[PDB]
Design an enzyme around this catalytic site. Sequence first.
Site, short mmCIF file in Angstrom:
data_model
loop_
_atom_site.label_atom_id
_atom_site.label_comp_id
_atom_site.label_asym_id
_atom_site.label_seq_id
_atom_site.Cartn_x
_atom_site.Cartn_y
_atom_site.Cartn_z
CG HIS A 1 1.26 -3.17 -0.71
ND1 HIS A 1 1.38 -4.19 -0.10
CD2 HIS A 1 2.53 -3.41 -2.20
CE1 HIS A 1 2.12 -5.10 -0.97
NE2 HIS A 1 2.52 -4.69 -2.30
CD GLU B 1 6.67 -6.89 -7.19
OE1 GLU B 1 7.95 -5.61 -8.06
OE2 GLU B 1 7.60 -6.52 -5.98
#
Length: 227
Positions: free
Chosen positions: A15, A91
């Site tokens: 991202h 994550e």
Amino acid sequence: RETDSNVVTLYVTRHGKTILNTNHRAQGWADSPLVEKGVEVATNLGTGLKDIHFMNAYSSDSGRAIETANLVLKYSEQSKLKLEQRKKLRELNFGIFEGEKLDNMWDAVGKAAGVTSPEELLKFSIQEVIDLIRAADPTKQAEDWELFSTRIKAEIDKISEEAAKDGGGNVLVVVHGLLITTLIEMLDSSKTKLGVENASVTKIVYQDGIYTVESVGDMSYVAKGKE
């Protein structure tokens, strides 16, 4: 079952740059929005992906991954493609370290490794580094290698198998730095890279159960968009 020859291409994308990324803080299950520079780069990423036609798009449920996926879909000229969020694409959970300055986290992890400087940690395998994060966390809320690697790989397998059942094709997957480093380590450790950049693309081909890592942390899409 007629899926055996189908090719799936995963555009495994980190991202854009967030507030916590900019302020050098651990951002795993913690999240924060893109900063304006991050928005600019993610916009160029979208433009640089306009000639890649996606059949599916996925992200984690992290706001930063959602925001980046929406920018990529908009500027790659696929605004109406549905975004599927998956919690298993998050994550690494940094446990007690979520939001902590990375310098402070690495000092605490280096102490757990018994190394003089967090510098010597770069020698370590990603497996042993991620293990050391949980070792250093007294709460044991951080994931270790076995927790993280297992959930990442199961979800990537699921996405790959489903895409192959739908005929093969390109799949956008907007995720996170350590996840990407971990996935490459699992698939082809000859290509592992720690520190893939915001808005970089790691292109992975899947066919008949076999993964091929084509590119790792590729910034060419951003550069194409930027021109």
